[PDB]
Each structure stands twice: as structure tokens, then as C-alpha cells.
Amino acid sequence: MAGRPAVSASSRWLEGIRKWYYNAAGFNKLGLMRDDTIHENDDVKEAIRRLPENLYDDRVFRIKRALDLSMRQQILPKEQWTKYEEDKSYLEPYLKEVIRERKEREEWAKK
Amino acid sequence: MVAPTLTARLYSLLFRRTSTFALTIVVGALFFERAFDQGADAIYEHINEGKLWKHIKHKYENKE
Amino acid sequence: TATYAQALQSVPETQVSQLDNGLRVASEQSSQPTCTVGVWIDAGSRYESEKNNGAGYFVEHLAFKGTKNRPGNALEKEVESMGAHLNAYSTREHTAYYIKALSKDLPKAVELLADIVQNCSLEDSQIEKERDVILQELQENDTSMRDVVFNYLHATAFQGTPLAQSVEGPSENVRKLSRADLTEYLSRHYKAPRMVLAAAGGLEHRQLLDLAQKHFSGLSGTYDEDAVPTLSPCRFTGSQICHREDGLPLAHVAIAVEGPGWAHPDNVALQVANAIIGHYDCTYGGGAHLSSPLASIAATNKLCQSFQTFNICYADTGLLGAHFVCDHMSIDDMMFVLQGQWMRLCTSATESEVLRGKNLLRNALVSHLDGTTPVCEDIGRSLLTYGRRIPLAEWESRIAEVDARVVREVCSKYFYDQCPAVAGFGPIEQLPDYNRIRSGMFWLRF
Amino acid sequence: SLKVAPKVKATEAPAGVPPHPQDLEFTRLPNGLVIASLENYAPASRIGLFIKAGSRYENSNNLGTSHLLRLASSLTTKGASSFKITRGIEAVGGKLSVTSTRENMAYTVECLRDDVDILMEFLLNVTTAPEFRRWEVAALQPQLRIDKAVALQNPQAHVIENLHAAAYRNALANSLYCPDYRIGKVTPVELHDYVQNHFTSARMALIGLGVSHPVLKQVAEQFLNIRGGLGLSGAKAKYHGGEIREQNGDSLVHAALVAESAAIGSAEANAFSVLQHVLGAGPHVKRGSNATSSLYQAVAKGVHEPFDVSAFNASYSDSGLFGFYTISQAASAGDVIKAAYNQVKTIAQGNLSNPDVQAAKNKLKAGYLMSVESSEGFLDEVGSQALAAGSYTPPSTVLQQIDAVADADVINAAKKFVSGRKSMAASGNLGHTPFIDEL
Amino acid sequence: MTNIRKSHPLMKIVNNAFIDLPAPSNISSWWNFGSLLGICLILQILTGLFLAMHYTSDTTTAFSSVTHICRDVNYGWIIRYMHANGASMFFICLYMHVGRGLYYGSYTFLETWNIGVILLLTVMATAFMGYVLPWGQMSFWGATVITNLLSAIPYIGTNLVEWIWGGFSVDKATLTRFFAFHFILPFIIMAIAMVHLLFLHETGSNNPTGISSDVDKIPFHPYYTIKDILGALLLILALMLLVLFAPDLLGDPDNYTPANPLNTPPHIKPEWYFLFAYAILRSIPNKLGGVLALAFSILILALIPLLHTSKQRSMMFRPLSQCLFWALVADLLTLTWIGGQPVEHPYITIGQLASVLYFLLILVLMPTAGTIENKLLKW
Amino acid sequence: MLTRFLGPRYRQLARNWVPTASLWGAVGAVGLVWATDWRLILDWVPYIN
Ligand code: HEM
Numbered sequence A: 001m002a003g004r005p006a007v008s009a010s011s012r013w014l015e016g017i018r019k020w021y022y023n024a025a026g027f028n029k030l031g032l033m034r035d036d037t038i039h040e041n042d043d044v045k046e047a048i049r050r051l052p053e054n055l056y057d058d059r060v061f062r063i064k065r066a067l068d069l070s071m072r073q074q075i076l077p078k079e080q081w082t083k084y085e086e087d088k089s090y091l092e093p094y095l096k097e098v099i100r101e102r103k104e105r106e107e108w109a110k111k
Numbered sequence B: 001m002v003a004p005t006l007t008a009r010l011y012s013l014l015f016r017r018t019s020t021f022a023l024t025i026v027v028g029a030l031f032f033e034r035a036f037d038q039g040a041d042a043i044y045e046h047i048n049e050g051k052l053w054k055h056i057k058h059k060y061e062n063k064e
Numbered sequence C: 001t002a003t004y005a006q007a008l009q010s011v012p013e014t015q016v017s018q019l020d021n022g023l024r025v026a027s028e029q030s031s032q033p034t035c036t037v038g039v040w041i042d043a044g045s046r047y048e049s050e051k052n053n054g055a056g057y058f059v060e061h062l063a064f065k066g067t068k069n070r071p072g073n074a075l076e077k078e079v080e081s082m083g084a085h086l087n088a089y090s091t092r093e094h095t096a097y098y099i100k101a102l103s104k105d106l107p108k109a110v111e112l113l114a115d116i117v118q119n120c121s122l123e124d125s126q127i128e129k130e131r132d133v134i135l136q137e138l139q140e141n142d143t144s145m146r147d148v149v150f151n152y153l154h155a156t157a158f159q160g161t162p163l164a165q166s167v168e169g170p171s172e173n174v175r176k177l178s179r180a181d182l183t184e185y186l187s188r189h190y191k192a193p194r195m196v197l198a199a200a201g202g203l204e205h206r207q208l209l210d211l212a213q214k215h216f217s218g219l220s221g222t223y224d225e226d227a228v229p230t231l232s233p234c235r236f237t238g239s240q241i242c243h244r245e246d247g248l249p250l251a252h253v254a255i256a257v258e259g260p261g262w263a264h265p266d267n268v269a270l271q272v273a274n275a276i277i278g279h280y281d282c283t284y285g286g287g288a289h290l291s292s293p294l295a296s297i298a299a300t301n302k303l304c305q306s307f308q309t310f311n312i313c314y315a316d317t318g319l320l321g322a323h324f325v326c327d328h329m330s331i332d333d334m335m336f337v338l339q340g341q342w343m344r345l346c347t348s349a350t351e352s353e354v355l356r357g358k359n360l361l362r363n364a365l366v367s368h369l370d371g372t373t374p375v376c377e378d379i380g381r382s383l384l385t386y387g388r389r390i391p392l393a394e395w396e397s398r399i400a401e402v403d404a405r406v407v408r409e410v411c412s413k414y415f416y417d418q419c420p421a422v423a424g425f426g427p428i429e430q431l432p433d434y435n436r437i438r439s440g441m442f443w444l445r446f
Numbered sequence D: 001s002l003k004v005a006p007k008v009k010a011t012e013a014p015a016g017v018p019p020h021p022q023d024l025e026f027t028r029l030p031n032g033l034v035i036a037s038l039e040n041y042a043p044a045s046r047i048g049l050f051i052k053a054g055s056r057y058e059n060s061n062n063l064g065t066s067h068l069l070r071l072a073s074s075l076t077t078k079g080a081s082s083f084k085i086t087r088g089i090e091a092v093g094g095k096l097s098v099t100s101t102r103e104n105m106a107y108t109v110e111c112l113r114d115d116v117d118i119l120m121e122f123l124l125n126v127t128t129a130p131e132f133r134r135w136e137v138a139a140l141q142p143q144l145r146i147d148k149a150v151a152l153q154n155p156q157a158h159v160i161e162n163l164h165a166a167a168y169r170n171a172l173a174n175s176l177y178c179p180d181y182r183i184g185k186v187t188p189v190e191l192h193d194y195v196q197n198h199f200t201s202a203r204m205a206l207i208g209l210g211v212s213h214p215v216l217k218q219v220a221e222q223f224l225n226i227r228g229g230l231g232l233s234g235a236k237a238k239y240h241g242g243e244i245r246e247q248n249g250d251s252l253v254h255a256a257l258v259a260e261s262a263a264i265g266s267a268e269a270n271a272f273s274v275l276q277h278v279l280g281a282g283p284h285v286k287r288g289s290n291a292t293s294s295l296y297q298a299v300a301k302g303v304h305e306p307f308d309v310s311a312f313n314a315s316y317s318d319s320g321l322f323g324f325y326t327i328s329q330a331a332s333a334g335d336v337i338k339a340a341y342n343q344v345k346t347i348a349q350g351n352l353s354n355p356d357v358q359a360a361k362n363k364l365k366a367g368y369l370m371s372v373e374s375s376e377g378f379l380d381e382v383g384s385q386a387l388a389a390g391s392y393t394p395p396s397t398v399l400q401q402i403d404a405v406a407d408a409d410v411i412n413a414a415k416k417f418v419s420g421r422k423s424m425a426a427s428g429n430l431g432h433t434p435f436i437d438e439l
Numbered sequence E: 001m002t003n004i005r006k007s008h009p010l011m012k013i014v015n016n017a018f019i020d021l022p023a024p025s026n027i028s029s030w031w032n033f034g035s036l037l038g039i040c041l042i043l044q045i046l047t048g049l050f051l052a053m054h055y056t057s058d059t060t061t062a063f064s065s066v067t068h069i070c071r072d073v074n075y076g077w078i079i080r081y082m083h084a085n086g087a088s089m090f091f092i093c094l095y096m097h098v099g100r101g102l103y104y105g106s107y108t109f110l111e112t113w114n115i116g117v118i119l120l121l122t123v124m125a126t127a128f129m130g131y132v133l134p135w136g137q138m139s140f141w142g143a144t145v146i147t148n149l150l151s152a153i154p155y156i157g158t159n160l161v162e163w164i165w166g167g168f169s170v171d172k173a174t175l176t177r178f179f180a181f182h183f184i185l186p187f188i189i190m191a192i193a194m195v196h197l198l199f200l201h202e203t204g205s206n207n208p209t210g211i212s213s214d215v216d217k218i219p220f221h222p223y224y225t226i227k228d229i230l231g232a233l234l235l236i237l238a239l240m241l242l243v244l245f246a247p248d249l250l251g252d253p254d255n256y257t258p259a260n261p262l263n264t265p266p267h268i269k270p271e272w273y274f275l276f277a278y279a280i281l282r283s284i285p286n287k288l289g290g291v292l293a294l295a296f297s298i299l300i301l302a303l304i305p306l307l308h309t310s311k312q313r314s315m316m317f318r319p320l321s322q323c324l325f326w327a328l329v330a331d332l333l334t335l336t337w338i339g340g341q342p343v344e345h346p347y348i349t350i351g352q353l354a355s356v357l358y359f360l361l362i363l364v365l366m367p368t369a370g371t372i373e374n375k376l377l378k379w
Numbered sequence F: 001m002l003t004r005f006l007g008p009r010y011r012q013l014a015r016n017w018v019p020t021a022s023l024w025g026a027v028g029a030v031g032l033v034w035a036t037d038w039r040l041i042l043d044w045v046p047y048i049n
């Protein structure tokens, strides 16, 4: 972590720290969206299988080029980083349904 | 359980459930191992009466 | 506001009356313009020795081929121009001849039914003609995997007993059967005390009794032989038959154990246990979401293309198990998960799934009794096995008394540690050895 | 039983079999929906939703949509998921099935009367508001091949599918199963279009057994106001007449020679129906020789080998098909078709007897009464009646209509088949099966 | 490439895991330690076997045989020191193998990770009995304090200590048992290591990114065999640098005097790879608490997979957890520094604080670190 | 234990497998006692006294 943009900042607002942390995380430097780095469990893996072909194929290349960047220990140029505002959750709608499906399935075996 | 033969009562009471099947094995091993040693030693000392140290000890340890 | 409990009581009560010779006349009044009337008799393969095995199938074939009163096709011509449907079935313990027609046509239907029973013709030319029909039908049933396997299961489960004989009988017996054996069989097993004339529809019970009194009074119920001889118990035999034939694509396997019987009250609890396991035959829309643990997984992993849970009930014995149709590389992959399902009810069955099984059993009884054709069969068959006819409300009372504890106790009494009978057919190379099958009948010790 | 000691519980005035059997309430909403509920007080409750969305309404582009829509049940909806529907229905023991003909597609639920409200909610969500998620529809595609393969195991199914294909060009010629090229080519947008066009009130009719009318009335006031669309191969049917011959080396040869009969409701359809039993359309005695069956008796002489002939009577809302269906060995396939065909010609020439008509009327009346005798058969009969017509005709009225069929009308019906434009569909070893021209 | 290769039902297909096995392209240099560990294992067996051809377990001729190995055996001096300094390389490689799993979330391979802890315990046990073999006043006394820790257990502590000792104290009976046990245990490690790979080949490696690498797998043979060979040389260079230029840099000088039960060394301490464990045990005055904390710290690895909280898997994109990870590594170095120092007033405070931080970081701070970032990423 | 969640279905599952788990610990108790002749335990059995 490094000095926060304002002066030094202990904890100011909420969007400022999230924006600061996004650049600190560094997965935008590899050209990856937030949901391109998630852990693939038995839930996320199914929610990937429901992705549309255009969206799933886009994810494959973003991961494919990121591993090329990690292989050479390089990053994308300053203009090709994933902007924090332009980052969008393409997997949250699909995760939520699998969350809904699994909770209903689990509670049906409990009642 | 309701049969006039011993083994039928021996099976349903104990061997019907594998949990109690192991109980008779472990408990049976307790009573078998204790009786077998006494059973298999008393016969051994009969073959060797007046031979081992147990059978000639009595003429030693002065007052004992 | 008419609850399910209140609607069961509204079902009309079966009326049973006995004739002079011991004929049981039964009926259930209704409002339908149509009705069916039939005669159920105590006859089948179990009542025939090896010498006259398959006489009932031979007798049933000639039953509609001609009578003393109506030689030739006149008996059939009367029914067809009348508008009625004539049917007849025979099993290892029962035979029936039921005719469905308009309620206004009941008097003629009963008159015909008496003629078929008492006045069979059995013309010498008809036996020779019907002999080729049985032989052709015997070659026909060789292609039915379901029927062949169940006859294989019956052959070894009750081996060395009358219950092991098939209804149709061996081909050699069919060829050598003569008219003398057939008429002797009819004169021995077709008697009033072992008979029941049932009906259901828009018919008054008084009319049916009077019609039976007019036509069935000529039936005899005397001492004839052994004064209506009783049966003999058949011993279940844990065994295994494997007709390995790789030409046939699929494998039909039926595994069953000894059942309680017709009159044993444990059938209700066992019928709940079968409903929990359920059935699946690859055309279900549920797929992986089926509530039955075995049905759902067979749809997910694609184990079988068909599987059913059955409880065949006989006089003092029965077959209780399952029968599945699967690939040649899935016999093991489901037989042992089928047995694992049985061990779940025997050891630890939750109350909720027993409630699911109870509801499934409740619908099975109510939905089966639709129309009048199943009603007469239920009325006729019950009076030959249960004695009285069990009302639907009484069935619910026994169903409502089943819980998890009963299912766990009842299943463990007939399924756990008992030697099963296995019948196979097709590419059954993968089918596990009997000791592997036997060791699947208990947990934590296999 | 034995819930409190006496519990006369339900010993009410009507209770079905006791003197009052209760009538069938019929109501038509201003929207155009039809509601019919018969309260028989039976323990079993059966509710069916009949929709005019048969396999014929598909055009050439979206063939097989009805087959997938029939399979589409037990899938995620707006109010209930696929898991909730399968688990919720089976927990109470209820049964959900989807009947489907070329004209109608009935959605039926059977359960105990205690839990009929739960089944109704699942039925409405399945029928009216399906989500049709892309992944779920995609996973159901291989079921189309499995369902069609098993349903086509019976050789008579293939001939009937080909018979309508040969006879018609328009809607009615569409098969009831998804075409071999369409398995996997169906898309969720097509299913939504099919539902939005055909699952729309005025083509629906709600029928229930053992449910009070207000329960049916209240649950049915949530429907649409749309009608059907257009179609390249399905819309308004027009009879063409053709001939389709398929060879598959089978031992037994199935042949279906039919002409154009009249549509339902029309008095001419009744003439064919009674003519259907004159020629014999199914056995009445198990393992019988079919003495009264004119078709079977006619082919009995000469042909001394296994065979089977009946009378085929497929009737629809706007047209129909009448003829005979034959099964015979390829060695003598032509003789059986020709002998059975010549018998029909004798009927057309007036060689018919009144007792023959009287027996056929008796068979028709009895055959119809047993059809509605069962709980499921009665619902299907009234359900389709509420769709093709707008009112329920009691069985007694139907018997009068059958009894009001003159013997001359039967002869004219035979003449229509003989002089009509035929449509032949055959299957099996067609080495000796005759063509249409050498009829 | 010459034929259709025919055949195939042999042991070559088992070797496809070394040639045709898919592997991530972006596998960093922190991964040669997997192959380095195998190099270290077969190196200890190779040198150990030749050491066992001149070593005699009797106390009267145990230490004198070690001197005979160096002084008399031709080229026997080097073999002893690649064995003594190889164990230093073994535990150097062992601790980075664990560290990479901590950083890159490799513990999500529950089967492989759990077998990894078993492998860690076996080597630490094996290296402990090897130190007692030279019998040199650090072997006797280093084994004295550690084995006596088992006396804190109740109702078995006294019984099993004598059972472990083969008598009333460490003596010739204990020495012979250790040499026999030290001979067999490494061959157990080979079997477990094969089992360790068997639970990993089912799921493959773990790219430093942490995302699935199934889209960018590469053949192992042309790319990582030459990468591991270079890594092996860096191991040989590092090991040989100690052996040929500072053979006794890591070992304690007091080990060169023959073991004397009547005489106590000025400072009693284990080898450097157990020093961090010594600091934790010495941080608690209680005897039963100290042995439990000594075992818990080693056995806390099995509890790590149950403490994962972050929606991501590798620490590559977890800056908050990265700061904690190097705090744990620094603290683990503080524990090593504390262990080699006598128990006095500047180190009791530092030792207790470092130990209480070692458990606090993994048990509390790290799981809380993953939860905090989950809020910062809107998930 | 022997369950997955905290529900009536699992509570029935746990209760249904308590008697077997009840007597399974006897093997762990008696068998361990039998292995090393646990005196405090072997002092109470009458025949093995
Ligand atoms: C993972 C495997 C092994 C490890 C980690 C290991 C570790 C050690 C260590 C740390 C020492 C102490 C040496 C000193 O401080 O001077 C030692 C000594 C010894 N080891 Fe091992 N060892 C292993 C395998 C073996 C094997 C397989 C053998 C024999 C076949 C063996 C035979 C010996 C002998 C004879 C000594 C005493 C001679 C000497 O210390 O130079 N070791 N070992």
C-alpha cells in the first residue's frame, strides 16, 4: 500500500479507498476485469457455463493474454489498463442465481 | 430371537447389526485371551511337573 | 370445502352376498351409464403340477372360442353386436373374465359369463388350432426382456415349488397337452366356493344377485376332490440366474427378496418404501430434480434407461425388490447404488421422505380406481386374497399410521441381511458376483 | 377414517352416486376464456388447461417448437423454479402431464383435493409465465431425440406422421415430433413467440374436476388478449392428397389408405364415425376372430396368414381423414390392401343391411360412453369440446345424434371415401405393396 | 518420432506425467523447489547410503567413526558435508515450498496440501534423528531436551519417553534405534512424495495469477525440464558453496566434542531449521502448554485451508494480505533469531511477542484481511 | 455430527445413527482397553479380576 491521494488519509469517504485499492490490486494492469480473477469453485464453475458465447469467449482471451503478461512478468501499457469506472460485473447476475438456486436446494433438504 | 435354536438367538441379538458384531469380537477376545492362557498354561505345566522354577521354588526363600 | 378425508367416506360401500353353492356375488353401485361384470377364480400356474402346467393359458384361449349353448363364433358375435368389450387375464394365482358394457345391458352380460365358465366346449379341432397359437405365442414372449427376466426371477426365487412355474408353461407341455387334461383341470379348479362374480357401474346389487342366482345356481360346490383343496407353502431360495447373451443391447436385471404376502399388514409400510425409491425410465421431464434419491442420480449420471420398484404379493410369500434396464457398462454402477438406497431406509430414513412416500401411495390408490374396470378387478381380487374388500378410507387409516420408525423397522426386517434372488438377461458381464451382491445387503461390514 | 369417533364427515345430499350427481358448470368470461368445473366430491382432483396450440400451428421456420414446448414443462418460471416445481409437485404426490395433439395442447395436473391450490399455482406459472432460460432450453435439446426415438419405436406412429404429411400441405401435415434437422436448432426466442401467440386466453379453456367454480373462476382471471399469428407451413389447413412410401426392411408392412372425411361437429363426421364401426375399428373379444368386423372378414378369405385391418377415422376442426389401416406380410401385402379396399366399394354400392348399421350404432354409443367413463377420459372429452365448440354436450344428447344418423348417410360417407382423392402412407418391405393408381 | 509407437501398456505412460503433462506457462521461479525437493531427497539417500557404509551406531564407536569417515575414507570428507549441508538445503527448499502455497493459495488442493504437511512432519522427524547420529555433545543434548518434552503428556508421557529412549535416558539403546529409523524413514518419504504428486496431477499446477490456466497450458518436457535443470544447478551451486567454502558455517562448533552426559554445553539448541519452533515452546513457562504450542505451530498448516476468506485465491491481487504475508515471514525470521539466543530479559519479551503474533496473524489478521478486501471489491 | 446442516431432516438423521455411533465408541473404548490391559478398567470386570 502507499500514501493515499488526498494528503495521507486515514479513512476518507468510501469510493476513494475503493478506487485507490483497485489500482493497488493490480489486476487491471493485466487487462482483467474483476470477475476474471474470481476463484472457480463448484458454484462459479457452473455460473461460467451459463455465460453467453460472446461474453465467455471474451473472458477466455482476457485470461489468455494475462497469462502471457504474467509469463513475461510484464504489464499492459498505461492506456490499455482496465478503468475502474469502466469495470463492470459480467458474472454477478449469473452468480446470484446460482446463489439463489443453491440456497433453495439446501433449505429444501433442511425443512 | 423367537426361535428355539441357540444360533438364531445368537445372530439376531448380536450379529444382526455390525456395530454389535464388533462388540462380541472385542469382548470375546477379552474373555478368550484370559481363559486361553490359563487353559494353555495349566496343560503345559502338567507336562513339566517338578521341572520348572515354579515347581522347585518352594525349597528356597527361607521363610517364604 | 370437501376435504380429502371427507371425500374418501363418500365412496359407495361394496356389497358382498353369498350364493347357495358358495359363489360370492359382489358389486359397487355407481351412476355411470356403463358397467363391467367379471368372474375371478382361484386358478393359475401355482395350482398346476408339472404334468398339467400351463393348462390355464390353454383353457383361457379356448374359453371364448365356443360354448355348449353357442358353438363357434356365436358367443363372440353376441358380444360384438351388443357393443361390449370382452377381456380375460390369468396369472400364477388368479384368472378373470370381465365384460364391459352399458349398465342397461347387465342381464345379458351375466348370462354370457355363466356360459363361458360352466359350458366350455373344448372342441377337438379347437385344441389343435389353439395349440399352434400357444406355441407361436411362446416364441413371441422370448423377445420380451421384462417378461423373460421376471420368469427367470420366479424360476430361482421359488425354485422347486409350484410358484416357479410360468403361467404359459413349457413348450413341451403345450404340445403334449390333450383334451382330457383340460377338462379335468376345469372340473377341479372351476368351482363355486373358489369363485367371485364382481361388478361395478350403474347396476343395482339386487339385480346382479338375482342374475347370478338365475345362471350360476347350476354351478357345483360339492366335495368333488379334497373338498376345495388348499395350497402348500413355497420356500424362497436366495439364488442367481444369468442368461448372458451379448447380442441383445441392454441388460434387464431384477433383484428381489421374500415378501410378506397378501394378508400381511406390512405391505402398506413396504409400499411406502417402494414409493420413496420411485421409478425412472429416461423419458421423465424432472431429470436431476426428481425427489427420489435414486431416480434423480440415474437421470444425472445416466445409469439406466428404466427402473421400477415392485412388490408382488402371493398367498404366503412374495417378491419385493426392483428391476432396472441399463447399459452393459452400468449394471454394477446402479445395482450397488440401488442396494445402497435400500440400506438407507433400513438404517436411517427421515420423516419427510416417508411423508413423500405416503402421499405417493395415497395417489396410487385413488388414481388407480378410475372408471369401473379397475374397480371390479380390485373388488374381485380382494375377495380372493384379503377376504373382505378393504375400503379406501381403511387404506388411508393404515397409511396414516406409517412413519419413519415403522419404515425403518419394516424395511430392515425384509431387506437388511436377507439373501436376495437375482435374475439377469443380456450383456450381464459387468453384473457383480452374488457374494458382492449379498455383501451389499448390510452396511459397515461388506 | 376414525378422525374423531363418528365423523359422518361428508355424508352430504348429492355426493355423486347418491341421487344428485351434480351438473357441469359452464361459464365464458368476457375476455373469451372458458371455465368448466364438475364437482363430483371425489378424493382425486384433476385440473386441465386446454390450449389451441397444436403442432399444426408451427410454420416451416419453427418446426418442432410444440414438441419442445411439450417437453418444456418442469422448467424454471417466474414464480417457481424448475427445482421447486419438480420437488413441490412430487412432495404432495401430484402428477403433471402435457397432452398434445395436432390441434390442442392440454396441460393437466392430478392430485388429491386437499392440495389442489398448490397444483393450480404451479400450473398457472408453467403455462403462462415461463422464463425459458437459454441454458435450460439448451440442455433439453437431446431429450427431443430421446423422446422421438422411443415414440417412433412403434411402426404405426411413423405411418400416421407420414399420412398427414402426404395428405396435407398446410398446418395439419406437421408431425407431432421435432424434425431430425431441428433437434438443437430450436431457440428460446422461438418458444417465447410460440407462447405469446398461441397461449392467449381465447384459444384456452380451463377444465377441472372436483373443484368449486369460484376457485376455478378466481384463479383464471389473469389471462391475455392475443390471437394466433401466420405461418408458411401452418395456419389454415387445406387437403392435398399424396403418397409417401418408406422402406426399412421390416418383416411386417403397415399401410394407411385414407381419403378426405368431414370435420367435427358436422353431421357428416358422425356418418363416418358410424361407418368406421361398420368396417370394424378394434377388437371387442380378446383373441377373437372378428366375425362382425366387415374389413377383417372380407380379407379373411384368400389370405390365410397373419394380418390385421381396421378403419382409420382421423377428424379435425376443419377437415378429416377417413380410410383403413392394414398390417400384413410383404409376401401378401397387396392382397390384404386390395381385398379390404374392395369391401369398402361394396358398401358404397348400397350393399349394406340395417342390422349392420344398428350394431355399429351400438358399438359407437358404447365406445363413446366408456371413453368418458374414466376420470381422465371425461376431462379430455369436455376439454376439447370447450375448445372446438363453446358448450358442453351431455352424453345423452350425443347418443341421440348418433341415433339420428340415417343409413343413407353411411352409404354417402362410403362414396366420399371411394370417389375421393386418396392419401397412401406405407412402411416396411414395400416390394409388393401397391401404389395409389393400382388401387 | 519414428513409428505409431505401437505398444503402450507399460510404465512409459506413467512417465507421460513428466513429458506430456499440461502446465501453466506463467509458472514462476518459485516452483523449481518442487523438483529441487526431489533432487534434495535423492541426494540425501545417495550420500546417506555411502555414509552408512562406514558409520557404526554403538556409542563407543559412533563419534570415532564419523572422524574416520572424514580423516581416512578417500573423498569421504565431502560426502559427510554435502549430507550435513544438504539437510540445510532441504529445509531451505522445504520452507519455500510451503511459503509459495501460502502466497499462491495452493492449499485449495486439499488432498495434495494435507499430504504435504505429512511430508513436512516426516522430514523434520527424519532430520531430528540424523542429528543425534554423530553423537557429539549437541546430538546427545539436543535430543535430550526435545525428547524430554514428551514427558509433559499425562498418563503416557513418562511411559512413552522411556519407550522412545529404550531405557531411562538417551544412550546406546536410543542411538542404535535412531540410525535404523533414520535409514527407513527417507524411503517412506519417496512413497509419500509419489502419492503427493498423485493428488496434484488430477488438478494440475497453480499459476501465480490464481485463475484457471487450462487455456494456456504448455508441454512440460521442452520448457520446464530445462527450467528445472537450471534450478537444479542453482541448488548445486548454493549447496556446494557451503560445502567447499564454509562447511561448518551453519553447524554449531560444540558438536565436535564427544557426547558427555555429565557435562552440559554452554548453550543447548537444535539446528537452525527447528530454531523457530524452539522459540515458540520457550515462550510459555508452562511445560504442557509449550509442547502443545510447539506441535500446534507445525500442525497449523492443516488448518490454513479452512481459514480462506478472500474471493480471490492467490495473493497476487490482494495487497492487504501481501503486507501480512511478509510480516509473517519477517516474524518467522524473528523466531529463528530468538531461538538461537539464550533466554534472558531482552528475548523473553521479544520471544513472547513474536510467538503471540505468529498465531495471531494466521488465525485472526489473515482471515480478517480477506474479508476486508471482499468489501472493497463489491463482493 | 454425522450431518451437514442444522435442520429437522439432519436432526432426524443424527438421532437415527446415534445407537450405532453409541455402540461404536465401545470398540474404541474396550478395544483400546483390551489392547493395553487398561488396569483401572480391567479391575472392574469380575471374570478378568
Ligand atoms: C530426507 C532424508 C534425510 C535427512 C533430512 C537427513 C538428515 C541428516 C542430518 C541433519 C544429519 C546430521 C549430520 C550432522 O549434523 O553432522 C544426518 C546424519 C546422518 N545421516 Fe541422514 N538424513 C537423511 C537421510 C539419510 C539416509 C537415507 C541415510 C542412510 C542410508 C542417512 C544416514 C546418515 C548418517 C550415517 C548420518 C551420520 C553421519 C554424519 O552425520 O555425517 N541419512 N542426516
Ligand code: HEM
Binding pocket: E030, E031, E032, E033, E034, E035, E037, E038, E041, E094, E097, E098, E101, E106, E107, E109, E112, E113, E115, E116, E117, E119, E120, E123, E189, E193, E196, E200, E204, E205, E206, E301
Ligand atoms: C520431501 C518433501 C516434498 C516433496 C518431494 C514435494 C514434492 C512436490 C512437487 C514435485 C510438487 C509439484 C511441483 C510444483 O508444483 O511446484 C509438489 C506440489 C505441492 N506440494 Fe509438495 N513436496 C514436499 C513437501 C511438501 C510440503 C512441506 C508442503 C507444505 C504445504 C507441500 C505441499 C504442496 C503443495 C500445496 C503443492 C501444490 C503445487 C501447486 O500449487 O501446483 N509439499 N510437491
